[PDB]
């Protein structure tokens, strides 16, 4: 059964970048992304 619920906003996932003195992350792949922007003229 569905009902109306209230909650506190989630600002997003929690991520900790594995920062180190000498650690680097390098991409080995890629993606071509086609996004859309609509603008009133």
């Amino acid at each position: 059964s569905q009902s109306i619920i209230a909650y506190t906003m989630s600002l997003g996932a929690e991520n900790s970048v594995a920062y180190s003195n000498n650690s680097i992350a390098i991409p080995t792949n890629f993606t071509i992304s086609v996004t859309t922007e609509i603008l009133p003229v």
Binding site: A18, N21, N22, S23, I24, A25, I26, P27, T28, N29, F30, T31, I32, S33, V34, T35, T36, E37, I38, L39, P40, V41
Partner: protein, 238 residues
């Protein structure tokens, strides 16, 4: 090409299913229609007069008594027109700002490649394509997004012969045993060499400099050529 074709094929769904935008143009249309409807609906308000119809007032009263009702209606309708025009001016200012932004986006995303971050989509902007929409424009931004990152050990510089070597264009990476030079946005490891590195000072300055071998193509080629020269000599001299 396949990734671009897949994304451009998903555009035809995500443009009208995910919503997000495309509500701006409809909102413009709805605001204009609402303004016009309210303006023409304010003609039914008496504004304190006996009736909201000019013909009725003119038919039911002599001129001296009619002017009072006519003036109440004139004041109310003047106010309604003034409100409509002021709201239209403010909305047209907003739309002019939006159109200036769209013109800048056409110049800098369609007519060229933009280095401005997030100006032409999320990611490293490759290109953009325009489409016309009712009272507006749609930009299909084609961008490059790095996909499968991996850990590496890294160093700011390499120490070989008491000299510090820095990458000409790239970073030094190590999987754990060997050191390569890679470009920063795509893992393409290359042997560290005097060609892709430049020497600056000694190794006592840079914090985090590591020891490794920087290979000199001139020396290796000279040694390999001298080996063949020695073989050619020993062919007949010895």
């Amino acid at each position: 090409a396949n990734q671009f074709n897949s994304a451009i094929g998903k555009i035809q769904d995500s443009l009208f299913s995910t919503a997000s935008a495309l509500g701006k143009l409809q909102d413009v249309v709805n605001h204009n229609a609402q303004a016009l409807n309210t303006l023409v609906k304010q003609l039914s308000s008496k504004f304190g007069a006996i009736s909201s119809v000019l013909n009725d007032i003119l038919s039911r009263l002599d001129p001296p008594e009619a002017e009072v009702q006519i003036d109440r209606l004139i004041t109310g309708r003047l106010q309604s027109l003034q409100t409509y025009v002021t709201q239209q001016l403010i909305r047209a200012a907003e739309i002019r700002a939006s159109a200036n932004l769209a013109a800048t986006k056409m110049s800098e995303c369609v007519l060229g490649q933009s280095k401005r971050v997030d100006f032409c989509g999320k990611g490293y902007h490759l290109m953009s394509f325009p489409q016309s929409a009712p009272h507006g424009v749609v930009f299909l931004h084609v961008t490059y997004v790095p996909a499968q990152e991996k850990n590496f050990t890294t160093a700011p510089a390499i120490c070989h012969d008491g000299k510090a070597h820095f990458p000409r264009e790239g970073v030094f990476v190590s999987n754990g045993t060997h050191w390569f030079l890679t470009q920063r946005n795509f893992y393409e490891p290359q042997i560290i060499t005097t060609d892709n590195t430049f020497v600056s000072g000694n190794c006592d300055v840079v914090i985090g400099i590591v020891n490794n071998t920087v290979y000199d193509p001139l020396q290796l080629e000279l040694d390999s050529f001298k080996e063949e020269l020695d073989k050619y000599f020993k062919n007949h001299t010895s």
